[PDB]
């Protein structure tokens, strides 16, 4: 059994090298994918100061997006936003609201089915396989447009720094189905604008809502990707500290057993020599 302790020391030592390398891999992938999040944080603002921000809307039909990670050493991010998805898919319900449950990421389909399997409809995965592009987020938004809901619900982690990641609920209102109706405040604040588009307001708010869905989805799955990287970077420095503490304790144990087996073998040799001497 004294080579079981040595092979366990081998195992924990290579694990503590693997996680020390994956911490640096995540720290490399965080620093080049931190600037694309900051370049994306501007474009969400014109639509949020234009369309407003209206989460508690009595939508007849809704689509929820919980955008998660794909690889699963993130350290409780996807479970956190899955709990936020159920905590907002119980909050927004007031009228028997049909909700479409859509998750982007392989670690979203495996948990939102455990939470809500009956209303779960679409699964998008490998959305971080090369990088996040607006054409991809546009195609996902077009697939979310094949459902014609009255609102869209976006659940992502707002990457603040390399430590703080807050889950954010962002909404997108369908143009004439609820968006022009939710601006109707003692009249309307939307009719103060001069529509300069080709056609009427009914197909400039349509184009503008599809664009807002694409922008919110693109910024969501970029910001959540940077939160995934910066949380795996700190969830692989607890693996290195745990594998270092276990290697320290196992090295101490192996030295105790090494000394004990030298003493035991020695006492056996003396006991065998004294029975003849």
């Amino acid at each position: 059994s004294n080579q079981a302790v040595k092979q366990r020391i081998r195992a924990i030592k290579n694990i503590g090298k693997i996680t020390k390398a994956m911490k640096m891999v995540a720290a490399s992938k965080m620093k080049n994918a931190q600037i694309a999040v900051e370049q994306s944080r501007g474009l969400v603002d014109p639509f949020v100061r234009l369309f407003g921000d209206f989460p508690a809307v009595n939508s007849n039909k809704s689509v929820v997006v919980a955008v998660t990670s794909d690889k699963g050493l993130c350290g409780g991010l996807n479970s956190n936003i899955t709990k936020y998805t159920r905590a907002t898919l119980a909050t927004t319900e007031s009228e028997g609201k049909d909700v479409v449950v859509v998750s982007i990421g392989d670690k979203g389909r495996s948990q939102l089915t455990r939470i809500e399997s009956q209303r779960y409809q679409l699964a998008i995965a490998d959305t971080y396989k090369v990088r996040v592009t607006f054409g991809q987020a546009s195609l996902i938004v077009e697939e979310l447009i094949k459902h014609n809901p009255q609102s869209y619900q976006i659940l992502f982690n707002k990457f603040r720094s390399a430590i703080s990641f807050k889950p954010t609920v962002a909404t997108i209102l369908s143009p004439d189905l609820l968006e022009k109706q939710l601006e109707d405040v003692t009249g309307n604040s939307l009719d103060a604008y001069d529509i300069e588009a080709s056609h009427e307001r009914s197909d400039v708010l349509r184009d503008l809502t599809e664009f807002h869905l694409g922008v919110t989805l693109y910024n969501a799955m970029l910001e959540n990707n940077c939160s995934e990287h910066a949380s795996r970077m700190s969830a692989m420095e607890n693996s290195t500290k745990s594998a270092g503490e276990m290697l320290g304790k196992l090295t101490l144990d192996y030295n105790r057993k090494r000394q004990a087996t030298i003493t035991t073998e020695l006492i056996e040799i003396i006991a065998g020599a004294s029975a003849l001497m």
Partner: protein
């Protein structure tokens, strides 16, 4: 290399090997810090990839072939060619034949100067350096 020591040290090393093995052992130590991290290939650092690709150059450089002992000028020309960077063209699986394609390609008039002087003199450090660029390495 991590455990093989020599308490005499490089005081009893052939000079001309001491000029180039002093950097060979340093880059091999950097590789030994960077080894077992090379299975994460797509996720680069591009500076630890430099010490990774150079250490993988120098590891396959040092292999021999069972009762073919190599004379010391050919050894120091080998770690000159691999250490200075004349073999960054060659992929890691053809450096056992890239060193065979140095000794056969570099003229044998530099080897007796390197054996005789017992160091890489700067005239020779221009000569054999210029001779390693007219070498037909098995590269692609």
């Amino acid at each position: 290399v991590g455990l093989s020591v020599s308490r005499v040290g490089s005081a009893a090393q052939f000079p001309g090997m001491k000029q180039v093995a002093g950097t060979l052992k340093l880059e091999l130590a950097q590789y030994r810090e960077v080894a077992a991290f090379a299975q994460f290939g797509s996720d680069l650092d591009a500076a630890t990839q430099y010490v990774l690709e150079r250490g993988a150059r120098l590891t396959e450089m040092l292999k021999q072939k069972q009762f073919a002992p190599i004379p010391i000028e050919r050894q120091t020309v080998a770690v000159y060619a691999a250490t200075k960077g004349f073999l960054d063209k060659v992929r890691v699986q053809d450096i056992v034949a890239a060193e065979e394609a140095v000794i056969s390609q570099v003229n044998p008039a530099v080897f007796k100067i390197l054996k005789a002087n017992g160091k890489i003199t700067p005239a020779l450090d221009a000569h054999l350096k210029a001779e390693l660029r007219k070498v037909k390495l098995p590269g692609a």
